[PDB]
Design a protein around this nucleic acid. Structure first.
Lengths: 716, 95, 735, 249
RNA sequence: GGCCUGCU
RNA sequence: AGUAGAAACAAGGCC
């Protein structure tokens, strides 16, 4: 039958009908009479629509061939011959522009004169039944319907026929051409009734070929095919198989509970080796401040001018000389770098306006100090294979180092009060609710407690230094840059003040990965002689740069004044995390506020004021040789703030591992102290897990010592 | 933790002496000469000036730390204090 | 006096101050170089936990595979992957018996979803291993490349737009003699059957960074695109199953987890009378993923899909069949340094099979020596067990089956147990009349776990009396206690854009106040610090200050120009009006009534060249990877302002041979923008159909010109011009 | 006119012609998401790192013809170098602030009508009345509650057709909404937003947010009302309760 | 010396 | 040298 559509109809219509065939997903080889019927429907749609044009009037202009002009409007514009999505697109667009009613089924054409749709259907059966059939299929329709049938008859409601009658003679001539051409073909044994509305399909997902063999190799050891295994599974029913293997399984497979008593836990062993060194990016306990007493705010001002003005406030400069060498570098380079920094600072002082940011010369001194041109050149393996020295990067456990007493004192003095306010908080919306007033009062109390704390000063120092370093690295990637360490505080009298700890020289910072390292050299003034705790300054070079006179009742001290100079490095991640050190304030004060709220849930009243003023209640916050010492809530605030600050400063994988594996043991010990009969399956394994995190970090070793002290004081 | 030292006194040069410290933990023995501050002696490790001569030991059942000094020198002459991690000290005088 | 914070625990219980034990204020550990060492170590460890299995050689991939299932029962407490098929089938049968109709229903909804799912659902995924280039690429890019290759090779069933048809094409590709791929350096290369099989069965290994809570780094894996559809269907089934199990806690959030934990502890302890003792085990499973054999997941799913259409069973079984034969790419490689000659070199991992061992240290030398037998075409066969939690939900199903297997109806003894399982972590409440009963119950639970290939970490687990325990960093002490140290890293600027960062910060403060019991004063301090950091990050200072920045001049002139300066946004250098009462209001709407009409109009102008919206999914959704958890998405309330710009892209593609991808990106985006202008609903609802672009665009041009004349700007001259231009593009597409 | 003209210009060049011809409508989404740009793992780090560069943001090409290349002192506002995989050009953040002080102005009176949810929140809070804070232990129990206070009793899919018919009336397709509640919602949001020119996508997104019901599990103590849950952070705490009555009541 | 890139 | 820690950075590539 398909030979007929090969022969007669034009290409355009046959591929339109083929795409309509693909539309609903049925195959053309099984039933083709539908293809012919609907392609004839589509053909009558065209032949009825084309050759029919309109101009600004009604009364369509009919031309056998559209002449070249702007007057190519089509009388009837076709609906079908398009995908369902576009057919409904045209339906909705016509409804929204023509203000007509939206039909629920697919029309075939639209006309302007009568501003409505045409649903053309030419069926094998006579018209006077198919018409009202499709009419009762369509609900309350104003779209006019018109149908032909092979006998040659026409019909329509309203007795309406919308265009010329010679066109309809055309239609029925086409119709009988179709008819008495099948006459030569002979199809009416099924042509009248060949489609009955079949819609059914079964989804087929068959495993075959290579993928089947893979299925045959992904079974238990004693199975040969997926078919057999699935049959076995379907036939499988529970018949007490877990019990049999449990009985047969060796009894050494057990989870015996070892009781956890007061005498069970042993102190954590600390590693032994050379004392632990300093790792901070700046001096914490041995910092010195040169000040100007200016009225500018933290960010307000220009760095270089402030630094120069602060440094001019000090008199007593001496020619620098080596006091304590780096022990691994070239100290003369550090000396020359310091003198170069001074010289270029003067050079800025001379000229017209202090630059906002200064670049330094790339001398051999800072070329060595900043580690320039030291990365091995990257080459290909095929060119370097016979080199005996060629091997992997050194990948082994870090060097072992024992704890020293300097970190303990540094933390002790990091929780001490100061003679300045190191936090100038921002603005918030004016409090409107009583709860907001309570929150503001609490916040004011904590700010009064923590602002005068060395932890806040360290927070500001780190934030400013890391912000400046990151910005300089991102801006001046190539050229070495000078950045004075600046921090602005407020005195007890209320006068604002600036403080200059020293200088940082940032080097080449072409940082691609988050782990890539930018090297800088840090110089900081101090008065602490490095000849008393040399092991804490393994990586520092310390010079003697001047003498300071601070008013004291013992005449006047006239102390020496040294310069701690070192080469340090950071990374994008480290800079970003060090510039978010202000969340240590959060951590600490959230803990304290949780304490206050928990206690106030007992007594139905806010308990902040008496906690902060009466200072009756105290918490164990340290141990003295006499015994455990307790301090007021403010001291707890400062201690927790210092702990968070040191966590942010000495952060490392060792800290995370020890924190987790020691929190586990802390929970076990707490369960013991709560009389909850705690038990363990392998306590030695937990101990070994904790002890492997303690390698060389001073902070984690101090935490381990604190944990041992807590165990000793606990378990009683 | 209260601590009491015993076993000090006047001794000959090249003589011997067993200090003992009763307690109420790691322990240490430290000394103080008349003209000076504290000097490390032993812990339970010994200092350079006393190594080989002196031996530190403890009985955890008796709650006592001992310091067995031998082959004494006139430069051992000090108050020997016991410490837990301080005693009043026991006078040792070598001559 | 020496300060010691830990002594604070002598007065404050450990859980009431547990936040102090979370050093989440410093930089988390990161990996620096290759992850090849970790990948090799994981492969060797997975293969040696199942050493007593049986060896075979796949006839298709030619790789050695180790099957430990039904192997000898363990005789020691060391990890073991010798799961027994009959035991696990019985466990699943008991799970079904205790929950009748679970499998049949879940299979019904899964069948609905599979037969109505679309291909585009695969684009909604993070990095995936594209085999066309042998590298990780965004899910959409890899899917597009694979579809292009399939269409070039003759597999065009995916044009039906159905994920099931895409999987049919994927499987049909397995039986092809020779496929063709494209490489740029374009060159057409031919892949034989075995090479393509291994490229479709392989995984890409990387090192996990920003992982807090352990000293050592780990390795993670990413699968290809051929196997992700089957994984999607299997995980859909597993999620539908677990949603019907109250003992599971994987498909829920954190608060639901806490609620279920409280309910189970109350149920276990309350029902227990005075005579019965109760004990809670806070258990962690050692080597959870390395001991889960994909064959056992195949067994579980084929038991689940019993009495179901065979096509459903086949499509759900394809995934574990491929995992059982999965291969893993070793990784980036190894970098060597020579200090004598002062140079460095980078050898790819694919050379580990043949490269001499003189360059490697003892540990790496032994690892390579042990893993070499499993190396096939630069990748190692990893049949014995899963790599990194790809089947999280099925593992949770197995754990829930174990938990339910002790409902006192199967224990047949006075003791019994229950609890909650979330993959790699569990809380087990066991009750028994005496300590001997508790010991026997825990011993039998451990033994049954060892029969299913699941191991309990004795070093990271402990048992106490009920009332105090831990679960996924949630510490329960007669009621869950807030931590607030897990969410600390999320208190900074997110890094999306100005308005997005502001809204996300305020919303995070609000949420942590609601859930994590953040205090009022602490919340105010957090708001102040966040505002400070926000102003210092975006160079948007109050405007009345003299802080010179790269943006302080325009901000200051805008400040001096504005009359009601209280309406200026913090992004434009205005005062901050936020407070505890205003944390749930966008900044634009909070300052709407205070803004000057000129500034208000300039700010919220639709014609601004900065705002760009791509799809309904990416309107106000921000992907923030939370600390100690999987990547998560958040809805943030924000008004589309001129500050909603999107930041610069990487721009490093210009120096790579894969430079033509940018031209293809630009052309695809131009075509997509044209289509959207032709089809405005393209973004909100993704268009569907089987026609091509130009057909729809030209035909809609026809119709829209028509109707927009029937009322609108068009004129006959223009309408006819459009009609004949449509004809022109038609004849152009003809040729 | 224009649209078909850039269509013809695209089809003029062979590569785009092939892309338009061979690519089917269904693959629309795929190729639209086809990109070499990886999703950032650490957005904060790079946002703090990119903002230190010059020209850190991106904007459409049209910015080159509305904003001058430099400001009064000569600080550059935009660059002509396009982004990696787009025709957009990289520009400095000042071009934002500049647009807010001398850029074109419009009538933003209809934004309150569009962003109905946020402005309703503001109005509800502005007329709220606070009360005394009572300090007592709060038994926070976890419950499933609806957060959206303006949901019109419609699901996502249920209101998606409404949203399309309100914004994209022609792409609705087969669906014609039956429920009369949807009829009235369509009428109201059609006549209200008849000429709003913000964007079809944002209008659809905000209509989805407003009409679609959404639910989440939260620890609550009292309240349980939709209006009382949006301020759950302000009314309920660990040991304090703040009586509050939104402006709606 | 000149120019390109900074998660590809 | 320095940062850092089971492998890396201490710029890369292209002419």
């Amino acid at each position: 039958m398909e030979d007929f559509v090969r022969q007669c109809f034009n290409p355009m219509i046959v591929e339109l009908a083929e795409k309509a065939m693909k539309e609903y997903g049925e195959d053309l080889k099984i039933e083709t009479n539908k293809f012919a019927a609907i392609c004839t429907h589509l053909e009558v749609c065209f032949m009825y629509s084309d050759f029919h044009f309109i101009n600004e009037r009604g009364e369509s202009i009919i031309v056998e061939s559209g002449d070249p002009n702007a007057l190519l409007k089509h009388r009837f514009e076709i609906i079908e011959g398009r995908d369902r999505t576009m057919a409904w697109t045209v339906v909705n667009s016509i409804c929204n522009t023509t203000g007509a009613e939206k039909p629920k089924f697919l029309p075939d054409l639209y006309d302007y004169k009568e501003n409505r749709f045409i649903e053309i259907g030419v069926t094998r059966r006579e018209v006077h039944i198919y018409y009202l059939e499709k009419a009762n299929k369509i609900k309350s329709e104003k779209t006019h319907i018109h149908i032909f049938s092979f006998t040659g008859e026409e019909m329509a409601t309203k007795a309406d026929y919308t265009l010329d009658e010679e066109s309809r003679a055309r239609i029925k001539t086409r119709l009988f051409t179709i008819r008495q051409e099948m006459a030569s073909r002979g199809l009416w044994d099924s042509f009248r009734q060949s489609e009955r509305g079949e819609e059914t399909i079964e989804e087929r997902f068959e495993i075959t070929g290579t993928m089947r063999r893979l299925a045959d190799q992904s079974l238990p050891p004693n199975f040969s095919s997926l078919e057999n295994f699935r049959a076995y599974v379907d036939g499988f029913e529970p018949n007490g198989y877990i019990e049999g293997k449990l009985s047969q399984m060796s009894k050494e497979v057990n989870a015996r509970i070892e009781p956890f008593l007061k005498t069970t836990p042993r102190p954590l062993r600390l590693p032994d080796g050379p004392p632990c060194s300093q790792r901070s990016k700046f001096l914490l306990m041995d910092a010195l401040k040169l000040s100007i007493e200016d009225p500018s705010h933290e960010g307000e001002g220009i760095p270089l001018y402030d630094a120069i003005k602060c440094m001019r406030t000090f008199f007593g400069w001496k020619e620098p000389n080596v006091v304590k060498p780096h022990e691994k570098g070239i100290n003369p380079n550090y000396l020359l770098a310091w003198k170069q920094v001074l010289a270029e600072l003067q050079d800025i002082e001379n000229e017209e306006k202090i630059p906002k940011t200064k670049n330094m010369k790339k001398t051999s001194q800072l070329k060595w100090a900043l580690g320039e041109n030291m990365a091995p050149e990257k080459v290909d393996f095929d060119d370097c294979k016979d080199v005996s020295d060629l091997k992997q990067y050194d990948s082994d456990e870090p060097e072992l180092r024992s704890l020293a007493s300097w970190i303990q004192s540094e933390f002790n003095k990091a929780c001490e009060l100061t003679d300045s306010s190191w936090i100038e908080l921002d603005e918030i919306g004016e409090d409107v609710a009583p709860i907001e007033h309570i929150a503001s009062m609490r916040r004011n109390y904590f700010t009064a407690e923590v602002s005068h704390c060395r932890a806040t000063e360290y927070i500001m120092k780190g934030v400013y230094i890391n912000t400046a370093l990151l910005n300089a690295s991102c801006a001046a990637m190539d050229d070495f840059q000078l950045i004075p360490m600046i921090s602005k505080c407020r005195t007890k009298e209320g006068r604002r003040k600036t403080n200059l700890y020293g200088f940082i020289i940032k080097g080449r910072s072409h940082l691609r990965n988050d782990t890539d390292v930018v090297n800088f050299v840090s110089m900081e003034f101090s008065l602490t002689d490095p000849r008393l705790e040399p092991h804490k300054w393994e990586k520092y070079c310390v010079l003697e740069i001047g003498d300071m006179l601070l008013r004291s009742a013992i005449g006047q001290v006239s102390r020496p004044m040294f310069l701690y100079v070192r080469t340090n490095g950071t990374s994008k991640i480290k800079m970003k995390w060090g510039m978010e050190m202000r969340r240590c304030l959060l951590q600490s004060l959230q803990q304290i506020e949780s304490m206050i709220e928990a206690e106030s849930s007992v007594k139905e009243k806010d308990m902040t004021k008496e906690f902060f003023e009466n200072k009756s209640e105290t918490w164990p916050i340290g141990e003295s040789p006499k015994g455990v010492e307790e301090g007021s809530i403010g001291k707890v605030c400062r201690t927790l703030l210092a702990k968070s600050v040191f966590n942010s400063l000495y952060a490392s994988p060792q800290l995370e591992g020890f924190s987790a594996e020691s929190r586990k043991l802390l929970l076990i010990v707490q369960a013991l102290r709560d009389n909850l009969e705690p038990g363990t399956f392998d306590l030695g394994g937990l101990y070994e897990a904790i002890e492997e995190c303690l390698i060389n970090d001073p902070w984690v070793l101090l935490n381990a010592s604190w944990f041992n002290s807590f165990l000793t004081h606990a378990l009683r | 933790v209260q601590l009491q030292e015993s076993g000090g006194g006047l001794v000959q040069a090249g003589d011997s002496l067993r200090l003992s410290c009763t307690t109420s933990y790691g322990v240490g023995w430290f000394r103080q000469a008349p003209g000076e501050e504290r000097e490390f002696g032993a812990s339970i490790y010994y200092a350079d000036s006393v190594k080989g001569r002196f031996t530190i030991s403890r009985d955890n059942a008796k709650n006592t730390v001992y310091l067995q000094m031998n082959s004494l020198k006139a430069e051992d002459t000090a108050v020997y204090y016991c410490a837990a991690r301080w005693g009043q000290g026991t006078q040792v005088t070598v001559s | 006096m020496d300060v010691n914070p830990t002594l604070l625990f002598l007065k404050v219980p450990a859980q009431n101050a547990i936040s102090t034990t979370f050093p989440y204020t410093g930089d988390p550990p990161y990996s620096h170089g290759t992850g090849t060492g970790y990948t090799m170590d994981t492969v060797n460890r997975t293969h040696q936990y199942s050493e007593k299995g049986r060896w075979t050689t796949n006839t298709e991939t030619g790789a050695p595979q180790l099957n430990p299932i039904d192997g000898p029962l363990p005789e020691d407490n060391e990890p073991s992957g010798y799961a027994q098929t009959d035991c696990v089938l019985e466990a699943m049968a008991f799970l079904e018996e205790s929950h009748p109709g679970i499998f049949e229903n879940s299979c019904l909804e899964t069948m609905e979803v599979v037969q109505q799912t679309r291909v585009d659902k695969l684009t909604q995924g993070r990095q995936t291993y594209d085999w066309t280039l042998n590298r990780n690429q965004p899910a959409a890019t890899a899917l597009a490349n694979t579809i292009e290759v399939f269409r070039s090779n003759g597999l065009t069933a995916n044009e039906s737009g159905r994920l099931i048809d895409f999987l049919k094409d994927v499987m049909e590709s397995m039986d092809k003699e020779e496929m063709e791929i494209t490489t740029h350096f374009k060159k057409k290369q031919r892949l034989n059957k075995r090479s393509y099989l291994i490229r479709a069965l392989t995984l890409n290994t990387m090192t996990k960074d920003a992982e807090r809570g352990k000293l050592k780094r780990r390795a993670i894996a990413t699968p290809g695109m051929q196997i992700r559809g089957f994984v999607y269907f299997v995980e859909t089934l597993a999620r539908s199953i677990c949603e019907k199990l109250e003992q599971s806690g994987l498909p829920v959030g954190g608060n639901e987890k806490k609620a279920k934990l409280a309910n189970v502890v109350r149920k276990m302890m309350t029902n227990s009378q005075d005579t019965e003792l109760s004990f809670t085990i806070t258990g962690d499973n050692t080597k959870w993923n390395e001991n889960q054999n994909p064959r056992m997941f195949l067994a579980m799913i084929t038991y689940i899909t019993r009495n179901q259409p065979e096509w459903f069973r086949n499509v759900l079984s394809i995934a574990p069949i491929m995992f059982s034969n999965k291969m893993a790419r070793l990784g980036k490689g190894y970098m060597f340094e020579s200090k004598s000659m002062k140079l460095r070199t980078q050898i790819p991992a694919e050379m580990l099979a043949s490269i001499d061992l003189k360059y490697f240290n003892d540990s790496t030398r032994k690892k390579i020596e042990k893993i070499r037998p499993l190396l096939i075409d630069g990748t190692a066969s990893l049949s014995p067990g899963m790599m990194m939690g790809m089947f999280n939900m099925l593992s949770t199903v197995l754990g829930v089956s174990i938990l339910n297997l002790g409902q006192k109806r199967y224990t047949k003894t006075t003791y019994w147990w229950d609890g909650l399982q979330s993959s790699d972590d569990f809380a087990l409440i066991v009750n028994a009349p005496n300590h001997e009963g508790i010991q026997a119950g825990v011993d039998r639970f451990y033994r049954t776990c060892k029969l299913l290939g699941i191991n309990m970490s004795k070093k990271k687990s402990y048992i106490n009396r009920t009332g105090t325990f831990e679960f996924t960093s949630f510490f329960y002490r007669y009621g869950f206690v807030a931590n607030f140290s897990m969410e600390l890293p999320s208190f900074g600027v997110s890094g999306i854009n100005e308005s997005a960062d502001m809204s996300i910060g305020v919303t995070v403060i609000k949420n942590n106040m609601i859930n994590n019991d953040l205090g009022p004063a602490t919340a105010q301090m957090a708001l102040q610090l966040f505002i400070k950091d926000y102003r210092y990050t975006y160079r948007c200072h109050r405007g009345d200050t003299q802080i010179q920045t790269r943006r302080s001049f325009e901000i200051k002139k805008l400040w001096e120009q504005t009359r009601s300066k209280a309406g200026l946004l913090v992004s434009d250098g205005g005062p901050n009006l936020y407070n505890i009462r205003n944390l749930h209001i966008p900044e634009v709407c909070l300052k709407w009534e205070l803004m000057d009409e000129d500034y208000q109009g300039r700010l919220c102008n639709p014609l601004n060249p900065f705002v760009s919206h791509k799809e309904i999914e990416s309107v106000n959704n921000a992907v923030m990877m939370p600390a100690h958890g999987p990547a998560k998405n958040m809805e943030y309330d924000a008004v589309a302002t001129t500050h909603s710009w999107i930041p610069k892209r990487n721009r490093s593609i210009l120096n790579t041979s894969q430079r033509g991808i940018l031209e293809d990106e630009q052309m695809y985006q131009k075509c997509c923008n044209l289509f959207e202008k032709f089809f405005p609903s393209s973004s909100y609802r993704r268009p569907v159909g089987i026609s091509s672009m130009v057909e729809a665009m030209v035909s809609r041009a026809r119709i829209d010109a028509r109707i927009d004349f029937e009322s609108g700007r068009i004129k006959k001259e223009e309408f006819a011009e459009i009609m004949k231009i449509c004809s022109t593009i038609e004849e152009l597409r003809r040729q | 006119m224009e649209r078909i003209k850039e269509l013809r210009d695209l089809m003029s060049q062979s590569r785009t012609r092939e892309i338009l011809t061979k690519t089917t409508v269904d693959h629309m989404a795929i190729i639209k998401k086809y990109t070499s740009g990886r999703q950032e793992k650490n957005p904060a780090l790079r946002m703090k790192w990119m903002m230190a560069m010059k020209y850190p943001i991106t904007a459409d090409k049209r910015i080159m013809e509305m904003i001058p290349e430099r400001n009064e002192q000569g600080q550059t506002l935009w660059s002509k170098t396009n982004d990696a995989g787009s025709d957009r050009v990289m520009v400095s953040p000042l071009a934002v602030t500049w647009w807010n002080r001398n850029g074109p102005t419009t009538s933003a009176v209809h934004y309150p009508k569009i962003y109905k949810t946020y402005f309703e929140k503001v109005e509800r809070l502005k007329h709220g009345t606070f009360g005394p804070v009572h300090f007592r232990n709060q038994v926070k129990i976890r419950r499933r509650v609806d957060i959206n206070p303006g949901h019109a009793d419609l699901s996502a899919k249920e209101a998606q057709d409404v949203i399309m018919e309100v914004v994209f009336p022609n792409e609705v397709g087969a669906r014609i909404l039956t429920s009369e509640s949807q009829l009235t919602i369509t009428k109201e949001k059609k006549e209200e937003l008849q000429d709003c020119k913000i964007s079809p996508l944002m209008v659809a997104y905000m209509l989805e947010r407003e009409l679609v019901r959404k639910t989440r599990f939260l620890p609550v103590a009292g309240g349980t009302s939709s209006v009382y849950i949006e301020v759950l952070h302000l009314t309920q705490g660990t040991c304090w309760e703040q009586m509050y009555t939104p402006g709606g009541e």
